[PDB]
Design a protein around this nucleic acid. Structure first.
Lengths: 71, 65, 77, 69, 71, 77, 76, 68
DNA sequence: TCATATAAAAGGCAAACGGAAGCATTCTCAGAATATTCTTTGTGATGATGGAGTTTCACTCACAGAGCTGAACATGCCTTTTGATGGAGCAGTTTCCAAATACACTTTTGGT
DNA sequence: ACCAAAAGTGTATTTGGAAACTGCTCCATCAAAAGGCATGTTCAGCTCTGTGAGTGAAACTCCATCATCACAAAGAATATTCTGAGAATGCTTCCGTTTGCCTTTTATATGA
């Protein structure tokens, strides 16, 4: 999806100027980093949920998995 | 308005090796993605307006972490 | 400016470790170095225990089982 | 030596927020403290060796801690 | 740029000493990146040791100790 | 042994990386220390290529490809 | 869990201590035997996973002896 | 007969745990050889650590130290 | 160095369960042929840049002496240490239903 | 334009959150006792600071030689496709080893 424009609606707010042209490799790297972050966070949260005995995820559990590490 | 969809969350989660996902976690995933994108764009804007060049993207964004 | 792990056992443990890894003469330890080491080790243990306690609170059961502390280290690591 | 006995660890956890502490955690606490010290002492002694000295000063251990992360 | 100081014929010569026969044109950038990472680590550790000794200059002892630490 | 990369460009790179990505203030470098660093980097690169060409010849390709270097780096620690 | 039978592992450990030709030196504990079992299995699984990754890079999905040989050589 | 204890399906199941899909026939000999070399290394280190102390009875501490 | 006991360690028996043989199956990998690509090789320019000789001055370094301070030891007394029953809160186990997730069909719709 | 894909609406399934029970092991306290930490002394070598001697590191200029771009070619190697055949798998049946459970057995710590 062209979610890139929706992502840039907040950066253009901070820049107060014309949106800069981002390379295709730049968007690819951003998407890969986002996927890596999401998969790492989800795996970490699921580990502690299964430790608690549950099988499904929860907002509290992913919130804890985020807060335990650095912010 | 909201560019984050349920199959997008579910495919990445299943890639992560989870089994079941609550429907109440979509808002939290949207929030964590939002703060992450805010962080990366803040680093990128810092790197662009601190460097002389403006149009190019500083690849040093990797070394911020 | 407080400590709660006894000074002599910690000092002798540190000295024996230093002698163990380094196969040289006994490295003299300045009395400030051991105190700072105790401060750092105490802080690290307190933070690890705090994070382990968070795991138990989310799991309901409070008793700190070693699975909790090892999992907290795994997430921290 | 591992002279860090049960009441010391219990009091440490008590200031750490722990109310009830299991009896199986003393060994793991001793192990994690031992490995943490085996890392910090190693780095500090390497630093002081670099300083061409034989005694160890709090500057060396603070440098080692900063290096560890 | 400064990073392009490690010129392509230098990389080719180093590879020839390494024993490889044919070199793909993509390997130059990757070799530059690997060298950059390795130099970053070694320089960081050597500079840390030099700051420990409280000197403004870096000596062969600092770099050899940094190499010994690296592993 | 004789050095492969010319000493001046490596010197420039080392000095700039030290002064910029290590938050050090105009550090001065010793020529012997810099030569030691150049030797270390050259040895590391030649050893990495010696390792990677083993993978390349293993894959049946007489040439060398970047994926070989990434894989060799991944295997080696 | 443990993927091999305990007794053959114990007897091979006994004979590889016997090859040390220091007379009788066999004094085996359950904890020591299981720890060495776990360590050996972990080393083997690391070697196999790395070798399979390398041979997948090679262009074959199967595994061959020259995979593990050079994987061990590169590791050290 | 000594190395016959390590049985062939053990190699297959261990590779399966290692993520390996298929396993060729010739791999068994080299698997047993690398097992032998790792065993002799670790047990050499364990026996020299046990000889460092005066008793000939080994302990779990000796082998875990031998790992390092 | 001798008693010795005792707790770790060696030895035997039945079950079943994983391993071995062998055959049918497939399918992966090795081989061959080929279009394609992209790396090499050679060479002229060439000027772009790295190597060599000179300086100076900021710095490192070897040493020398003064202090102190850390290692080693003697002593009291107090936080540790076992054990002890209790006990008592709390972790592990079992049921149930119900909200919440997975799944299927369809339709908007928006991504290319 | 247009076709994959996500949203909406059910629909059957399911697992988790609470309740009830049970045993289990951990907090607390008392006693004591006793082992180890805090305190105080004493000596020596080690660090710290200084002080000057030497030196080498940043800055400079100039020349020569290696990179580099550009070119064309070329052919070596690579990616691709097609084919078969040995080997890797699956399945079944038998059988030989393993493992729990007892039953001896003796090497070592403890005392003297």
């Amino acid at each position: 999806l062209p979610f890139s424009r929706l992502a840039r609606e907040i950066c253009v707010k901070f820049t107060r100027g014309v949106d800069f042209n981002w390379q295709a490799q730049a968007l690819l790297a951003l998407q890969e980093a986002a996927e890596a972050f999401l998969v790492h966070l989800f795996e970490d949260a699921y580990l502690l949920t299964l430790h608690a005995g549950r099988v499904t995820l929860f907002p509290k559990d992913v919130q804890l998995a985020r807060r335990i590490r650095g912010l | 308005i909201q560019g984050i969809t349920k199959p997008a969350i579910r495919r990445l989660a299943r890639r992560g090796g989870v089994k079941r996902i609550s429907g109440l976690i979509y808002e939290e995933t949207r929030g964590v993605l939002k703060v992450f994108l805010e962080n990366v764009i803040r680093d990128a804007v810092t790197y662009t307006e601190h460097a002389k060049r403006k149009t190019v993207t500083a690849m040093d964004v990797v070394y911020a972490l």
